[PDB]
Design a binder for these strands. Sequence first.
RNA 1: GCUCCACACAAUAUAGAUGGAUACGAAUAAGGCGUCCUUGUGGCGUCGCUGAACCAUAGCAGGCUAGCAACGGUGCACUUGGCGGAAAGGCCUUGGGUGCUUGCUGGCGAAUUGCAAUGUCAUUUUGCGUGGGGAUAAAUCAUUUGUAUACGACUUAGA
RNA 2: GCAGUCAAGCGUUCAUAGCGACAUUGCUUUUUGAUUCUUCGAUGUCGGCUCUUCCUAUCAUACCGAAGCAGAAUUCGGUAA
RNA 3: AGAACUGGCGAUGCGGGAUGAACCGAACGUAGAGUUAAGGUGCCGGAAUACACGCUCAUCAGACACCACAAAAGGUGUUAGUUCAUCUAGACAGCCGGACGGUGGCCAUGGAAGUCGGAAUCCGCUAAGGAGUGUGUAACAACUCACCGGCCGAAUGAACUA
RNA 4: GGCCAGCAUCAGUUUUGGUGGCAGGAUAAAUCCAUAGGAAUGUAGCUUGCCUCGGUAAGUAUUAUAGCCUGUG
Lengths: 234, 171, 191, 137, 46, 53, 197
Amino acid sequence: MPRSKRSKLVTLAQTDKKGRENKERIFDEVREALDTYRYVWVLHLDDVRTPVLQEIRTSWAGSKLIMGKRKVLQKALGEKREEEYKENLYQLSKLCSGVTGLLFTDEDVNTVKEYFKSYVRSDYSRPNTKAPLTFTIPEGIVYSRGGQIPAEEDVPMIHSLEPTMRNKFEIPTKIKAGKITIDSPYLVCTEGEKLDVRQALILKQFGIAASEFKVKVSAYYDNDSSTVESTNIN
Amino acid sequence: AHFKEYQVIGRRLPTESVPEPKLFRMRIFASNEVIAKSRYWYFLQKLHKVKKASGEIVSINQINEAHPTKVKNFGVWVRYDSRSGTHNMYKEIRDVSRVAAVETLYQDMAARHRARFRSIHILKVAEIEKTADVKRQYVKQFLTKDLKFPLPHRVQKSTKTFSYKRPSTFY
Amino acid sequence: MKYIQTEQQIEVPEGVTVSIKSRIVKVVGPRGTLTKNLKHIDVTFTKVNNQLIKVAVHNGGRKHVAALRTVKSLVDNMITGVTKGYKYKMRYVYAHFPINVNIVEKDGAKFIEVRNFLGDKKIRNVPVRDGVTIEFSTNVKDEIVLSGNSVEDVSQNAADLQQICRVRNKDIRKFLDGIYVSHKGFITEDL
Amino acid sequence: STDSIVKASNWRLVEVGRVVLIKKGQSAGKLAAIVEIIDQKKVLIDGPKAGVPRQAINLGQVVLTPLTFALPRGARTATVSKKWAAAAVCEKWAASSWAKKIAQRERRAALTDFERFQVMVLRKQKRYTVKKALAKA
Amino acid sequence: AKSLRASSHLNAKSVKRRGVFQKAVDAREQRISDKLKEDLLKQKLE
Amino acid sequence: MRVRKRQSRRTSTKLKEGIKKKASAHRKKEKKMAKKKDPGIPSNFPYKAKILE
Amino acid sequence: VEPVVVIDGKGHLVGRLASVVAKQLLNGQKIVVVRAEELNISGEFFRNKLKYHDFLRKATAFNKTRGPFHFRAPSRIFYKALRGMVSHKTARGKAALERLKVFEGIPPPYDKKKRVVVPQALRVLRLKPGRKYTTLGKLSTSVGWKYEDVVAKLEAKRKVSSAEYYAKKRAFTKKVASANATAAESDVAKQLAALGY
RNA sequence: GCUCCACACAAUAUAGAUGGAUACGAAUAAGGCGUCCUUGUGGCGUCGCUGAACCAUAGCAGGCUAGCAACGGUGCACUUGGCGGAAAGGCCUUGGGUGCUUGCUGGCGAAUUGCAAUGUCAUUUUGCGUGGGGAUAAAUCAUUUGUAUACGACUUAGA
RNA sequence: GCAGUCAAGCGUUCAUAGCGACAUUGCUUUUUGAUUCUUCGAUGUCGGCUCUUCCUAUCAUACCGAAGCAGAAUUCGGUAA
RNA sequence: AGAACUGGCGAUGCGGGAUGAACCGAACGUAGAGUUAAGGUGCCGGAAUACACGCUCAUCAGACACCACAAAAGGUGUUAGUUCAUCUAGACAGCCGGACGGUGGCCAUGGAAGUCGGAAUCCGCUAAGGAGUGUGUAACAACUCACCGGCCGAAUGAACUA
RNA sequence: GGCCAGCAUCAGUUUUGGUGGCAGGAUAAAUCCAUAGGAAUGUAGCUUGCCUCGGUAAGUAUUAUAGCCUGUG
């Protein structure tokens, strides 16, 4: 566009793009993990809290979780059998569809899947998921938790977020002088319905975390067997 | 009228102690051989200390296109000495012959840059031997397979001052 | 660069029908029908398989491509209005004097009416546009829900409604009273 | 009906193998195939069956006739003449009312004054019967 | 002061005209037509 | 609404001669004050490698 | 070629039709423009309004009555575009102007007369597609013309009468074409075809 | 005396015939015509790409005559009805009467204007004189009232 | 106004050969609204009674945005003669 | 401003720049034919509303002396070019999530937790995450952005020249 | 014995068409003719998913049930 083009943002944050060199570094690191560790895994985790990911990383000192862009991990595993870093290694790359989540480990293959079956943590609604539970906002004054907990311990919502309640959340909030209030007990979501993204934003602003989370796994490479296996659990 | 390509040659008036001075050659585009020799002397004066009095035209001949009927893309080196100092330029042209391509290039330069023929220089011209060597989109759009475009505004001429038919734009 | 041609697809819902002979356009659907005068825009519609239409602009400039893109946008808007419709909403609020908005059938035009705005004795009137149907929101205090097949009519009606009540000679920061848009969702809701 | 009418934008699009009738210059009045486009304002016309030498020509010097016939892009004049002889497009042009009106005006330009008198006599004779047919139905 | 051509005062007068301002002229024209018909009958009687 | 007067486009012969004298003076001044890398191969040329050899 | 030429004013640019009629009048050919209210002008309507308003502001100071006139009628406005193209002060210009005639609409008897158009003056042929253009009648109403509402009614009535006349003419021409086609293949018709007629 | 219809000769010139100003509307990234149905922003065929078109154009500047084919084409004065008010003053149309008809076939005159001299063929107006129709008024000067005025001028009255 | 500093650019080494937009430092009578009771050679006339007309670089009237505009009142800015 | 030389006028008509002391053309007896300059070819005004290629919507552009004072740039008004970068181990934009822990870092104290006040601004893990670019609370909270990850896909971004 | 014009052919000035024989280019280049090769904006055939039962889309296939370019004579 020679003219009348949209202006670019000029924000002056200290951070800068890592560039292709970071991708090459992750590629070399994945190759080192492939040539060092025997077993390999392709975890699927579309979203995870950063502290939860750190807690998963600290669960064992004997293993490493080289996260990266799915294309980078695929090229490290070989996009095709001719490009595979190791025999039959290309098959492990084919199974991945989601975020990964590669988990090289020297630990016994059974213990890893057992720990994954045991691990579980609370998580947000993660839209396109069925509603964990049905609830309705109190017809009286709104509170920071949304009334999920008894009002005597709850505190009124800060006024500063009220306009977002009218614009983003679509709730017909009325900002009464002293506190925000709604004339009627608006329902956040019915049980089992596919959540709208605005409904998930409302549940996040209210702090509800009824949904559970547990990383799934689809397959694990075995360098000793030189072949992928399709064991899976959720 | 139409531009005519020409080649020029010289040897700087051979003198004693320098038998057979080295020949030089430069393709030139001009309406006539006189202008071609003038541009050749003007180029030799810039690339060498020699002068028209110091040399002579060893030969002059027109260069007809080997395949004038054939369509050909033609990239062309260009530089114009205005308004600021001279700088390199490049343009693609789809023309049936190199001379018509040079004429369309001179017209596009005089239009989009107001450059005069005295300022324009043609450092090089070459055909695009193969597809996808083209870069700018305006030539690429004509390369599409089975391309077809209309001419909706066919404004027919009317020699008569009056027209009882109320002519249509058809098409 | 005087592109050799440009075009944009126009998806046709199976229940929609949109005859086009002249540049004037017409559309029909379960919710009704609509029409528009596009003769000025100089564009050529082209049906392919009755499920799509490809407007085209040969040898056009960048401004002509922008005209073609807005033509496709107006066509998609007319299709969404004849299929889904539109259901505008506008909350109103007051500080000390309650608002008394009410519909009236003066002169047969179904004039909108407002009273006691900020205590003013003037009775402002905002005539309803053709097609759009005013209706107060059910079980929702101090609200009105405009709706109409065309975005243009309902949008101009909401604009005139918010403009007729504009405050004057008073600081806006203290006087929050005045009608304001609340939502611009489709009549379906949820389909 | 659910059909979405669209009528018709039946442009006479330029394309390879299109025949066109030059309207001026030494090649005026002769058909030529468009072997290949050069740009938006030029095309490589070829009319070897008409005897016109192959050359690039501006689109504004020529008009696009409705008739069309297949031609590979970049075709040499021999293949163009072969495709012209195979398609027999000249017969389709002579069948066209446009070529008929052209030949009619051309014959009218050459008419002898005695031929003009015979034309007036035959026209009066035809007009007599044409008027006798009127009112009788 | 507001101009005599000012659109606001003219619109206010146009709104005021719909009521008694028009009803009075209507009743006046009706009474005038009635008096005219009476004057016509008084002449036609003789 | 109320159109305002536009400046005259007339040549103003007096102003023409004055501008000519001012131009000659500016040229003399620029002449008196006068006493006090190749671009390289353009990008996107299809045959840049051929010129190097 | 004809004693008079009733050019149609619809769709024509002001300056081109003015320049062509100004030369046709100098040749002695008679002309009578019609439907001047439909005459078009290049550019958006606000430009033409700003241009006409500039001419309206000018006037003699000590006595405006003797200053230049600013006719509001579309026909007089088109005449002003032509009046400057001819040396009206000369007697030859006074003679050439007498042959000229202009009227809004198509007043009788001209409505029954055949009308023509000048292709060079047509807006459709000279103007580039998609460009804005001003209608002379809208500028006339903007400059205070107060007859556009009247001309439209007589124009619609004349259009309805001409449409009925064309319907009768088509009903007659169909029978005429049938009477000609029934004579087709007659030996005299074959001789006329051999002679190009 | 005046006014209308023509003709007898004149004067007056022409801003300039030397076949016909041949009539749908809208758009020009669309249309004219025919057909058909499901009457619609419908399907099909046809056409432009200029008026280089349609009619009319033959007879002494267009005669005197004999017939053939059809009851057509058309000038003239009447005549039936209708439409047209934007400057209508124009158009359509019923019924015969009277001429031509080159639609077709024949009988005569052309000359000498001497090898061309625009080689005279149209109306705008005006006067007298013919023969067929129609009826017999206003303004101003002057006096005079004032709704007016420098004079002019304006508004009324008086057989 | 005078003296000075960085440089977005320019210019054969290259800004430090030379210039240089936008910024900036030191002075022109006191940091406690204290003083400022200074007013300093126009050598040439400008200023006023009736009155017409034109311009915006708008005091007011008319329509708007902003300003700690809660009101009133007020400031600037846009159009407007 | 002060000196030399080359030229027009003065003493000079004629054609064009609408006219003009200087500009362009130009060797002044009376006429005919013919060919030209400057200057033009829509009308006034004799001559193409010629050809072929590119830019211009101006709320008084332009036909202007404009290679001259306002003239340095500003315009998200257009067109063509030069340079520097990313890219199917995913280019710009578009929608969703992460944006972590010593930590509520060290100095002011009815209170600053990144965002009322001062000097630093690291390690730990990451694909990344800044003692923090902004919105907002008394603080918090929360929202949001620099950069990454999730989805369509391919050309995209910045500085200059004309 | 004078005034005004036309015609035919002539002398000078001059304007606009038709038409024929020649010299020169790379002894024009083209086009065309035979050939050795190359490729796609891939020709026929073949192969793969689809389907209104046969055309789409991508691999092969350098002339085959079309053709193009380069050099040579």
